[PDB]
Amino acid sequence: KERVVAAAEKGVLYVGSKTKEGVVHGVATVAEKTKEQVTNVGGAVVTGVTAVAQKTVEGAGSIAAATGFVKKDQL
């Protein structure tokens, strides 16, 4: 009776050569969370799907993916 489903069915030179490099392809979740509670106080709470597909994050002191990150640096 009750049914839930998720389907994701699908100098440098490239001479006649296929490349995919950085790429998120298939993410099926079908999540179910009854009676969910979240109480964040000055932090970071992540309870969902995330798909980061960066290719170049060149840079000193940088951050590529800052999920659920809590940065409290001092001096």
Numbering used by the authors: 12 to 21, 36 to 100
Show sentences the authors wrote.
Mutations and multiplications in the SNCA gene, encoding alpha-synuclein (aSyn), are associated with familial forms of Parkinson’s disease (PD). aSyn, an intrinsically disordered protein, has been a significant focus of neuroscience research not only due to its central role in PD and related synucleinopathies, but also because of its abundance and function in the nervous system. aSyn is primarily concentrated in the presynaptic terminals of neurons, but is also present in other cellular compartments including the nucleus, and is thought to interact with membranes adopting helical conformations and tetrameric structures. In pathological conditions, aSyn is thought to misfold and accumulate, forming pathological aggregates that disrupt cellular homeostasis, in a process that may ultimately cause neuronal cell death. A central pathological hallmark in PD and other synucleinopathies is the accumulation of aSyn into insoluble aggregates.
Consistently, our group has recently described the novel variant G14R, that is associated with an atypical, rapidly progressive phenotype and widespread neuronal loss in combination with frontotemporal lobar degeneration-associated aSyn pathology. Interestingly, the effects of the K58N mutation are opposite to those we recently reported for the G14R mutation, which strongly favors 1PF forms. Altogether, these results indicate that the main effect of these mutations in fibril architecture is the modulation of the WT conformational landscape, favoring either 1PF (G14R) or 2PF (K58N) forms.
